[PDB]
Amino acid sequence: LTNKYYCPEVFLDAVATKLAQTAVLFLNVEMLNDFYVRFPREVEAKLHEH
Amino acid sequence: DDNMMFITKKMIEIRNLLQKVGQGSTVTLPSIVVIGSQSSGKSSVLEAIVGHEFLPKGSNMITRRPIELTLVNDPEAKVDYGEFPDLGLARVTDFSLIQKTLTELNQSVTDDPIRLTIHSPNIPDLSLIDLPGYILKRKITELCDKYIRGPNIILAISAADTDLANSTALQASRRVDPRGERTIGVITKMDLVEPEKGAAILSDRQYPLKLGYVGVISKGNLLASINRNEKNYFGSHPTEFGPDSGVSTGVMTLRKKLLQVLEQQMSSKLNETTEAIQRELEETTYQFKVQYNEQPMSAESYLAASLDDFKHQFH
Amino acid sequence: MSSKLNETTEAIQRELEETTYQFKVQYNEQPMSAESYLAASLDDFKHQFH
């Protein structure tokens, strides 16, 4: 890991994955489950109303 | 001077809402409390009637329960109509029906004060309450003393025939207000006294209070009339109590003064009241945070969630 | 009109007897509201999504 200035590919890829994963935790919670709770009520209301 | 009434009306609307928020809504805004002795108490009821329009009062009254009068400026409204808040959506045209019902409650006789709402273009919006006047009797004073203590604006009335020292109203207003800073006095039944006799009473230094006293004689088209007589009568002794005389009288100036005072004192309690409401909003918001993480929910979301479940289940 | 009543009436019965047997061959006369169709489809979509 210590040759981090010698392997910018490996480093930048690791920076990308971490950001992706912690970004992914908030994304799941805040967006995904919100989607699982609102989506069926929204489909029912809007279908019946349509 | 419409910008001027309007501030009061929104304030009284606010008085009614703080009133109606919930169980812990200990908090409120003040309003006029009216107290008078027996001859003085008759004078008070008559005056209050004289003040906007004729209304069921007097005859025999238990006076067991207070009556909260909340008034509304009524521009664009053509019928003298007054309604009961609990008696929802019911509007009364003739005040004789108001006399039969509110008197039917007086003989029904809890200690709950009936709220009233009356709309008339002639009346300026106000917010007075009339509790039983001093004359079982211990029970009655317990209530009066209560109501008066807290910083309401207190309206004492006094019959001219009785001396000032004698009357319970003014003396109790001096029991709960030694500085007389929050209390105005009305001298009633003043048509049967010499003008010297009016200057004795309308102006005194023996028991002086801010906001002064207001002498007035109170007793269809009755409004206009009580108005035309008040204009006409000072004419006999225009000097003794007319413009620039130190005393103040007649219904129009008194109503001006009441507006002003209500507007002043309410404006005053407004900051601390508002502080209090903010405290009760902060509490409720934080509970929303510790419980349910402040996340939204409608009953329709809850039922839809459960029905999607039950359907996968049954399949 | 009365004299044409007997001939017109049978002829309506004929058209109806045909329609009824077409209901019998097609769909096996099983009853159907639009709502009963939309309900079945919606209950399938809700199991799929969840």
Curated annotation (Swiss-Prot), chain B:
Residues where Mg(2+) binds: S43, T63, D130
Region listing for G5 motif, in residue ranges: 217-219
Regions annotated as coiled coil: none
Segments forming domain Dynamin-type G: 26-271
Region ranges (G2 motif): 62-64
Region annotation G3 motif: where it falls in the sequence: 130-133
Region (G1 motif): 36-43
Location in the cell: Mitochondrion intermembrane space
Source domain of life: Eukaryota
Impact reported for D308A: Impaired mitochondrial morphology
Binding residue positions for GTP: S39, G41, K42, S43, S44, G58, K189, D191, S218
Chain segments carrying region G4 motif: 188-191
Its job: Constitutes the soluble short form (S-MGM1) generated by cleavage by PCP1, which plays a central role in mitochondrial inner membrane fusion and cristae morphology. The transmembrane long form (L-MGM1) and the S-MGM1 form higher-order helical assemblies that coordinate the fusion of mitochondrial inner membranes. Inner membrane-anchored L-MGM1 molecules initiate membrane remodeling by recruiting soluble S-MGM1 to rapidly polymerize into a flexible cylindrical scaffold encaging the mitochondrial inner membrane.
Protein name, per record: Dynamin-like GTPase MGM1, small form
Organism: Chaetomium thermophilum (strain DSM 1495 / CBS 144.50 / IMI 039719) (Thermochaetoides thermophila)
Lineage, opening ranks: Eukaryota, Fungi, Dikarya, Ascomycota, Pezizomycotina
Record gene name: MGM1
Curated annotation (Swiss-Prot), chain C:
Subcellular location(s) of the protein: Mitochondrion intermembrane space
Function recorded in the entry: Constitutes the soluble short form (S-MGM1) generated by cleavage by PCP1, which plays a central role in mitochondrial inner membrane fusion and cristae morphology. The transmembrane long form (L-MGM1) and the S-MGM1 form higher-order helical assemblies that coordinate the fusion of mitochondrial inner membranes. Inner membrane-anchored L-MGM1 molecules initiate membrane remodeling by recruiting soluble S-MGM1 to rapidly polymerize into a flexible cylindrical scaffold encaging the mitochondrial inner membrane.
Protein's recorded name: Dynamin-like GTPase MGM1, small form
Organism for this UniProt entry: Chaetomium thermophilum (strain DSM 1495 / CBS 144.50 / IMI 039719) (Thermochaetoides thermophila)
Gene (UniProt): MGM1
